[PDB]
Ligand binder design. Sequence first.
Ligand SMILES: *[C@@H]1O[C@H](CO)[C@@H](O[C@@H]2O[C@H](CO)[C@@H](O[C@@H]3O[C@H](CO[C@H]4O[C@H](CO[C@H]5O[C@H](CO)[C@@H](O)[C@H](O)[C@@H]5O)[C@@H](O)[C@H](O[C@H]5O[C@H](CO)[C@@H](O)[C@H](O)[C@@H]5O)[C@@H]4O)[C@@H](O)[C@H](O[C@H]4O[C@H](CO)[C@@H](O)[C@H](O)[C@@H]4O)[C@@H]3O)[C@H](O)[C@H]2NC(C)=O)[C@H](O)[C@H]1NC(C)=O
Ligand SMILES: *[C@@H]1O[C@H](CO)[C@@H](O[C@@H]2O[C@H](CO)[C@@H](O[C@@H]3O[C@H](CO)[C@@H](O)[C@H](O[C@H]4O[C@H](CO)[C@@H](O)[C@H](O)[C@@H]4O)[C@@H]3O)[C@H](O)[C@H]2NC(C)=O)[C@H](O)[C@H]1NC(C)=O
Ligand SMILES: *[C@@H]1O[C@H](CO)[C@@H](O[C@@H]2O[C@H](CO)[C@@H](O)[C@H](O)[C@H]2NC(C)=O)[C@H](O)[C@H]1NC(C)=O
Ligand SMILES: *[C@@H]1O[C@H](CO)[C@@H](O[C@@H]2O[C@H](CO)[C@@H](O)[C@H](O)[C@H]2NC(C)=O)[C@H](O)[C@H]1NC(C)=O
Ligand SMILES: OC[C@H]1O[C@@H](O)[C@H](O)[C@@H](O)[C@H]1O
Length: 417
Amino acid sequence: IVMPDGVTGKVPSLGWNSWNAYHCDIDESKFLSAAELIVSSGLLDAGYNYVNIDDCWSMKDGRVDGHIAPNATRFPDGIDGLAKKVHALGLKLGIYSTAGTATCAGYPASLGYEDVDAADFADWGVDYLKYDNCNVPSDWQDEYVACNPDFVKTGPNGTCTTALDPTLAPPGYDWSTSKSAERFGAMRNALAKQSHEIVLSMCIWGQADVFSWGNSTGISWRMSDDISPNWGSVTRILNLNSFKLNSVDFWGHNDADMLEVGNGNLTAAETRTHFALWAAMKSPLLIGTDLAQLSQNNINLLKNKHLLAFNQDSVYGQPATPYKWGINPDWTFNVTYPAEFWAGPSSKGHLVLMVNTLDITATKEAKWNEIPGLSAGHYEVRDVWSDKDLGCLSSYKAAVAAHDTAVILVGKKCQRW
Ligand SMILES: *[C@@H]1O[C@H](CO)[C@@H](O[C@@H]2O[C@H](CO)[C@@H](O[C@@H]3O[C@H](CO[C@H]4O[C@H](CO[C@H]5O[C@H](CO)[C@@H](O)[C@H](O)[C@@H]5O)[C@@H](O)[C@H](O[C@H]5O[C@H](CO)[C@@H](O)[C@H](O)[C@@H]5O)[C@@H]4O)[C@@H](O)[C@H](O[C@H]4O[C@H](CO)[C@@H](O)[C@H](O)[C@@H]4O)[C@@H]3O)[C@H](O)[C@H]2NC(C)=O)[C@H](O)[C@H]1NC(C)=O
Ligand SMILES: *[C@@H]1O[C@H](CO)[C@@H](O[C@@H]2O[C@H](CO)[C@@H](O[C@@H]3O[C@H](CO)[C@@H](O)[C@H](O[C@H]4O[C@H](CO)[C@@H](O)[C@H](O)[C@@H]4O)[C@@H]3O)[C@H](O)[C@H]2NC(C)=O)[C@H](O)[C@H]1NC(C)=O
Ligand SMILES: *[C@@H]1O[C@H](CO)[C@@H](O[C@@H]2O[C@H](CO)[C@@H](O)[C@H](O)[C@H]2NC(C)=O)[C@H](O)[C@H]1NC(C)=O
Ligand SMILES: *[C@@H]1O[C@H](CO)[C@@H](O[C@@H]2O[C@H](CO)[C@@H](O)[C@H](O)[C@H]2NC(C)=O)[C@H](O)[C@H]1NC(C)=O
Ligand SMILES: OC[C@H]1O[C@@H](O)[C@H](O)[C@@H](O)[C@H]1O
């Protein structure tokens, strides 16, 4: 959705969220340190300007006088006070609620209280609302389910049918009229009336066919169930998103979930693949790890100027898309072996990404005639990882480590005859 200030949320949000770092165990200091570190590590200069509180910030036992109250032990100066400290640092503050009767962690949530919660958030100086999908009451349940492989039984190729899912929405069903759309729309409407602009991030896990109506409601929408810091989830989410890229443009981006850079058992190669594809798919990019514990190597990864410029491109709204699946036939839904060959235009040139989904070194070749928007010829090519000029190339071939991604920026045409 377009926001009144004409820029906030047009390109993917960039920041840091407490969830993958701390889950439910958060307090002010964790945000103050995250913020100090975003500034001092140069991440803010790179573009990461949201410090986002996720679940577990409020007094858990209920609303206090009709309002969600900050847990004052965790936030001794309140959300408003944190907001002031964060705003002073040149950052933005995100908070979290749920379109249900309690948050996913069981805290007070916003369904039916949108106008009061939106006013509190606005009055606190909150800039971003991640809005979750837990605890939807029976009366607010959707009639149908949408074909979401993360939740519903699928046949081969991630397909849904009536026989597998009796409640699958009939063809032509308008998801904008669903209860999910209403629940989210109600918070959209509530925020819109406040003077302080808050962007809405729709944490709906790819449910309710949010791809078709999300752009009328918020600036981003989760398109899958929660990421986990392993390769299985990286490929799971990559595969799901690869089929949903047509919903991604300015003001409205599929959210491939929070970054796991720094976390779990992802190797350096997997981490690169994960960040590069998240950036290229123009998901919001929300760091999800303790920045004090993050290696300078992962910090440099996050600051990749080319991946960020591409993600943040203000002329080209579409993301990089798969042009060739690779091991499988094009358009093959496959959780372990998603589309390998990706490209999209940008102001800086064409970004090309080649994901080695195999667990052994493989040679991957970017061939210009295969890439939409390119043609046979010679282009200047730059390695995105090293920033190295690779020269004027008729194609680009690399030995790509297991689970790694070769990433190049294809520049202006060169050396003709
Ligand atoms: C496994 O399931 C998958 C997922 O459902 C399914 O995938 C489809 O596969 C078929 C081929 O079998 C694809 O059909 C081809 O489409 C080619 C170009 O399509 C582009 O446009 C597609 C249609 O766009 C419409 O719909 C969208 C939303 O519905 C809407 O936003 C648009 O406005 C428009 O109305 C579009 O779906 C597709 O998007 C997919 O692909 C891009 C990557 O290109 C990706 O980024 C997206 O995320 C999404 O996955 C894309 O935008 C078309 O050129 C091609 O034509 C070939 O054959 C014809 C013969 O007529 C030749 O003329 C031509 O030269 C080509 O050789 C063909 O029609 C279809 O697009 C896939 N759908 C999706 C959603 O991915 C597989 O079929 C399943 N496999 C099995 C075994 O069943
Ligand atoms: C979600 O909703 C938003 C808001 O309505 C909507 O945003 C719009 O996106 C389009 C498509 O990217 C924007 O229009 C483009 O703007 C860029 C940069 O200014 C231009 O380069 C584009 O022009 C090219 O393409 C045109 C035809 O497609 C050609 O006329 C021209 O020659 C260029 O090649 C293009 O105009 C538009 O500005 C925004 N709207 C706003 C208000 O910002 C978005 O598309 C929605 N998402 C989806 C999936 O529909
Ligand atoms: C607010 O947050 C504080 C601090 O995290 C919580 O304090 C804990 O309270 C439980 C029982 O109430 C104890 O078991 C813990 O030892 C306390 N921890 C600390 C460090 O004080 C408190 O529960 C939260 N209150 C609400 C209502 O959300
Ligand atoms: C996902 O794609 C992978 C790669 O094509 C498939 O894995 C292959 O499966 C066939 C059948 O078992 C084997 O002959 C190959 O040895 C496998 N290749 C690799 C590299 O593992 C897998 O079958 C696909 N999954 C689904 C559900 O279709
Ligand atoms: O409990 C908080 C969590 O709730 C889940 O529903 C969500 O997908 C996660 O991103 C995290 O927000």
